[PDB]
Every structure is written in C-alpha cells, then in structure tokens.
Amino acid sequence: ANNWTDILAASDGDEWAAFKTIEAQADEVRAGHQALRRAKPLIRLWMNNPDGSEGLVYVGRVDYDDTIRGSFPFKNNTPSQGVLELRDDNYLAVWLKQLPNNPELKKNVVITVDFYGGKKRWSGLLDKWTIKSKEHVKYLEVTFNDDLTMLQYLLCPPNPALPIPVLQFPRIFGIAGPAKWAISTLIFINLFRVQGNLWTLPDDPFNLESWDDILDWSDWQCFVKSNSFLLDDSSVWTFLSSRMNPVDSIIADALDDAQLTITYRRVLTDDGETAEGFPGAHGIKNGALVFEIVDNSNATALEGTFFSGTIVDGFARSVLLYGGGFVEDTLSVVSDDQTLQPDEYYQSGWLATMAKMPWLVVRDNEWTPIESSDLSWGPAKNVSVIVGGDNPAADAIAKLIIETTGNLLGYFLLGGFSSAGTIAADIIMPFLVGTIAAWLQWKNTGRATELGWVHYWELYQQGAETNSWSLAALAALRGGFLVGRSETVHLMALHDSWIIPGLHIDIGQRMGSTVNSKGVENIVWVNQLEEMTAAWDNSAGQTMPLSWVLKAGKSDRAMSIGERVARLAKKMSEALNNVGVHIVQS
Amino acid sequence: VDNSNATALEGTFFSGTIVDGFARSVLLYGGGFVEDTLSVVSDDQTLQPDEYYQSGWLATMAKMPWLVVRDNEWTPIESSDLSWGPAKNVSVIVGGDNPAADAIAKLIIETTGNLLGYFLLGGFSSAGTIAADIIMPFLVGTIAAWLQWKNTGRATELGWVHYWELYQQGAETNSWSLAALAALRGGFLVGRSETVHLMALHDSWIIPGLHIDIGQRMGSTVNSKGVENIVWVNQLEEMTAAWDNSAGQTMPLSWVLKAGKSDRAMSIGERVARLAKKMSEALNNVGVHIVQS
C-alpha cells in the first residue's frame, strides 16, 4: 500500500517522477498480462501403466512449434473432439504409430494441453489417429475425445447398489434433491458400482464423516466432489430418473434447467497438484479425473445476477420470480442493487469472474480488439407444452391384473353376472388404459404475454425417461418448456484482445457482448459462455497463431443443420433405447 | 462364403511384417465363449492349397492369404488413409424385459390361479396363510432382466483409464433371452479396435477381383516412420472401379480399395445414414412388439 504521499516522498517531491513510477508499475502489470495471454501451450502425452497398475505414466511432450496444427474446444456440458496434427518424423507421432502393434503397451493414451501454466487444461482420451498424405507428404492427424465422454459410457441401472443380472428393482431409479448434490450423487453411485460396489453405501456419500478412513480409493480412475445433502446451497431441487440411461443423458435436462456446469480436472500429481473435498482425495493417483458440478451462472441464486445491460450504465441485476406452480419464471429487476463485491476482487493477481458479480463486457465498435462473427436472436415458439402418455398410478399392469380380478370375483360372488342388479366396483379398469389423468398440459402465460396474438400453440414433449413425469410433474413440465424458448447466440473471435479465456472468463460464466449495429449499439447481450475453442496452424501456406473463438449463449435455431441432425439423432437413439427397455413382454 | 477364414481350425494371418511375411494365428475362446483372443502358431505347418499349384490361378484362398501391398518411395499404389483406433467400452449391458419370468400369459394365468388358491385358503380373510407368487405383476422387468459382460481381454488391452460400459439393443429386441451368448457377442461387436486402410491401385500389378476378392484378407503397408515393417492385415471391404471419359478431366478405369472397416473413420454423412437405418429398423421392431391396450 504505497500511498501517494509516500510515492511523492520517494520521488523527492516530483509529481512527474511519481506518476512515471506509477505508470511503470501499470505497464509491468499489463506486460505480465500480455505474456500470460501469449504464453505457449504445454502438450503432453501420458499412457497407462504397462504392468496394469494405477497412475498415468508420462510418455512425452509435443512442442507447440513442432505441431502442424491443433484445435481444442471447451464446451458447456457437451463432449468435444481435440485434433492435433504432427509430422510423422515426430517422436510422439512415431510412438503413437507403433502403439497399436506394441504388445508391451496399453492401448489408451491421454493428452493434456495446459494453458497459462496449467490453469486451463484440456485433457482427453485418444479417439484415433490417421496417416494422411498431402502431396506425398505424410502426417499423423490424432483425434482425442475430451474427458466428458466418460459420462456417456457411465450409465445408471435401476439399482446401482445390487448385482445387475439378478434383480434390478424398482423399474427405474429415481433420486431427488438439491440439483448439484443429486447430479453429483448419481455420478458417484454409478462410479462406486462400476469400481465394484466393494463397500457399503452410507446415506449421504458426500458426508465425509460417514466414510471410513481405512478405505483405499487409489484404484479409482474417476472421482466426484460435492457438498453433502444438508450443506448443498443449490436453491432449486431436481428429480433424476434412469432405466439404464447414460448419465449425461440423465443429467442434461437438469443441468440446462438449473444452468449448472460440469467441470472436469485431471489431477496430475506428478506436477505437484493435489485434490480435496471428496472421499479418498488424498490417495488419488496421477492423471485421475475429478468431476464437480458448479453454478457459474448464478441465475437461480437469491441475490440474482446480471441478465442485461447497456454500455452506458453497465449491467442490470435481476432476480428470478416464480409464478403459480413454479413452472414459469420471470425476471424482476433489483431497483436498489446493493450486493457486495466478492472478496476475491480485492485480492492481488485475481482475474476470474465470480458468479455473483459478472464483470466482462466485450464491446464491438469501429476500433475493436475482437471480431464479432454473428449475433442471432429468435423469439419463443410454443405457448403450451403437453407431456404424458400413460399414468402408471392408475393403470399399472399389476393393478389391472390383481385389483380388477378381485373386483370381478367380488361381483361374481355377489351375483352380478347372474342378474344385472348388483352395483359393481371398478370392473372396467382394463378398458381405460391410458385415459385417466394420462397427460399434463401447461400453458406458459409469460410466453403468451411476450409473444402476443399470433403465436404457435402447443408442443408435445417426451422426456429422457419415458415414465417419470408422474413421479415429477413439475420437473417434466419445466424440461418440456426448456425446448421452444427465446434464443440468443453470439460468436466472437478474440484476436489480440486483452481478454484471457479460461482466466478472465470460464465456461458457463455470464458475460456481456455488444455488436456495432445501428439500433443495438447501447444494448449488451448477456449470455453464459458456452464454447471456446483454441486453434492454431503452423503450416507454411496459412499460418494462424494460437487464437480463441468464443460462443456465448446457445440457440437450436442458429445451430448448423449437421449439428442439429446429430443432436436429434442422439436424442432419438436414447429415447428408442428407453422405449425398447420399457417394452412389456407378451 | 467364408473368405476371412478367421474362425477356422487352422486359423489365418492376422498380422505380419515385410521382412518375415505373414504370421498365423488361431482364435482361442475364453470362459463363456464371449471373448476370443489370438494365439500364434509357433510352428506353422499348414499345407498350401491345391489351387496354388494350378496354371492360370490368381485368386486368394481363404486359408492362405498371400497379397501384401507395399508402400515405399517407389510404391506402385497411392495410400490415402491408414487409421487405427483402440477399443472403447470394457463392458456391455444387453437386456430389458425377460419374457421367461414375466410374460403376459404368465402374469395373467399363473397369478390369477395363485390368487384364487390364496383366496380359497383364506389369505384375504386373515393374513396367516402363506402365499405362492401372488405378486408377479408387481415385479415386471426386474427379475433376471439384464445380461452384463465385462470384456477382460478388452480391459487388459486398454488399461487403467478406459470407458466403462455401454448398453446395446439387438436387431431383434426380444431375442437375448433366446440366445444370451449371441446377444452378448453382437453387443461387443460395436466398440472394438478398428483399422481401416484406403489404397488406390493406379497401375499396380494387383488385379482386384482376380488376385483379391471382397471379404478376403490382404496385408498392406504404409511408408511412415515407426511402422515400415508392420503389415496391417485386414479383409478387403470395398473396391470401386471408376472411370471418366470427359475431355476436360479424364481418368482411365482405376480401382480403389478399402481394407478393414472402422466406425470412427467413417464420414459423418455415412455414419448418420447407417445410424438412421438402424434406428428405423429398431423403431419398426419396437412398434411391432407393442402390446395393445
């Protein structure tokens, strides 16, 4: 804390000298920021232990200058593919090529790309490699899948705590609780099951006093860290249901509705990194993956967050207000905003964006450090949603057999079939399957008010789990209304802007952006960051330095046709699996 | 026809080197026959086919693959894409409902008979009577409804870090109970190690269809450092004969081979088309297996 008087005294009463001192300090801080922004990435390949033990084993390092090209995207709750092109004379390229036919090696490889000294990390398993010939010149194009693909291969059986081919009761597994706790708990229960179900599950997995200290978790390749059921600060709850559904498909709707983010970190204990906050966090091996559900948007918080703003008065704080039945949520602006700044904003060397106080607004004008590719807005579509089908609470097959045959036998013993005088008691239940309270229709009053006289009427929505709406009516309706809403998406390319992706702003964290277009110069579009790709090309023909491209917000409308088809195909395949497993045998 | 001859008693060639030729291996099935590994024949004494001693013969016999397509500085072919990917999922789950336990005929007749017997004994008059399976409709889809298999060979290949499991739906949705082993092997057909090689035979001496036919095993090499000696042995999967007589661009009749298949290196359009085909067939099957209300 060098005061102005102290600086002036050090400069011997010369105001110009003192201000030059201050300017030099500011210049050195700016230079440090620029060096951090322009630092080269650290690409390292690791392998499984050939003897079959735990802990990833260091294979080698690829130099950024020795790459041909690279592309690594970070996406919000979505798996992404990283691409790295090498010359075939490169030693790691040779190692990868010899890997398939090397009998002394395990076939799985992990890439870790570190930006800003490991603060930002892209880690993923090898997907494949290809030997490609450009004009008789051969190069190895290596494709990795980011570490969020493990949630596709993790699936939740109806009873994750019992053997699967023996008895899986009930028909579907349903867990309800605070959103972050329930998502993390589902993931942890499936991790426990797939690691072997060796020990007994306590009531709350994340109540660390319930787990014995003698237990060894070092063989686990994946961990989940979360707070306990009582200590979880998630304002909203969630109901997750599964019948052998993949975990990511189970949790996608809840993550979207609560605006939560899945963060994965591969703890390289060879680099000195440690982990804490989950069972067995002290004995984890090198390269073990850790998952954490975070609230980077802070939209559901009590104090709210920034949903809009203008370039002349900054952001505007709004809080969610829920209407009748909590299906509908609107925004009420905080007229007298008195939220305190985070304590992190008063710490030297801090650069991140706190969820409660977003700060990053990226302005586009005649002199702009970024380029804005496209900003697209689209209104909401359907005022009402219908979700349903059959209601098992009324016409389950067990009821249809037992209760109806008992009622028929009672009617028969009273003599109803001998003469019609007797009054029956529900002997026609099998005739009304799928008709009694089989649907839920909700009209979004806020959406209708926003849309007006001419609007699309209704949409039928089938959930990820086909027979869970009766368990959670409200969750089903909110998941249905997740589909046809107002959508804004903005594409930015940060060429030499002072913004440092990962450091200044992270995935899932709200930021504002402007577009230099007449009529919306003042407006700031506030979206939670959804994608950021770091790409480079070292080719002689076209040479692109390592550059970041951001995509803030998401929109099904402006999504490309190929991506739309792929997403639809994935959802259709998952729904087909769910229906096929819900088929009743003849 | 069996052109790969992989399941034969004498085995076939699954690998090789440009300095030692091909290596003979035979399939060895583990416990339950779900998993098959390769065991090399150290003393290979398989006799040559009689067709190899006949004048004018050019074809490849299944038991004795011979054709290795070599790529080097003076290669007669043009290699385009040699891609390898490792196996993905260690374990597979295939199941749903097991009709042998909760078929609708059972749920109606047997449960009605058991309930009638319990009623006549007086179970509903007083809880003293011991029942005999009057709760079967309550446990539909829960008794022995799944088959889970962990591929130990795949786990050994992959190592400490691997994808865990995958649910697989068969072509016929109600047949795993009829053939558990076949269903498990069909499920394990999906996420396996894949190698695919693309070659263009411009003026090479190789005669597609005559020297090598579709489905027959051939070896190929790529002139890339670290893998010159290796010979990737795959059964031929595609060969296209194409020509263009246009004055602007003119190409004579040329053949392009694709040996081995891979879902990973397939184009996105072809992947979407195949997935749409499988989804349409499965939707037809589910719709036809629907039970009327």
Add this chain to the structure above:
Amino acid sequence: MTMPNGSGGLDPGAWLSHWVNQADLSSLAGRTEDEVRAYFENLVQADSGWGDASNTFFNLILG
C-alpha cells in the same frame, strides 16, 4: 428438470413414489428379493376388492 420448490415438487401419490431416494442411499442395498417380496405381499394382502370377495364368499355364500 429442476423443481424450484423443495421436496414438495414430488408427487406422493405416484406409482414409484415410495422408491424415490432423497438422502437414504443405504436403503438401495436393501432392495433385494426378500424385502421387495414382503412389501408387495403386504400390499396384495391389503388389497380391498379381494378382501371384500373373501368376506362375501366365506360369510355370505358359505354361511
């Protein structure tokens, strides 16, 4: 798929509402054949139409 209210977002009258886990995950290992069988046998014994039929058969028809 989020419930803005607490546990009140669930439906107590649903078919499988008794089997939705909130924080009692130690009960998952207790869903074996015997316990589920006992629970459902208790429900079937408590079934009302069959009990009324039993009353009619054993008291009215059989004296």
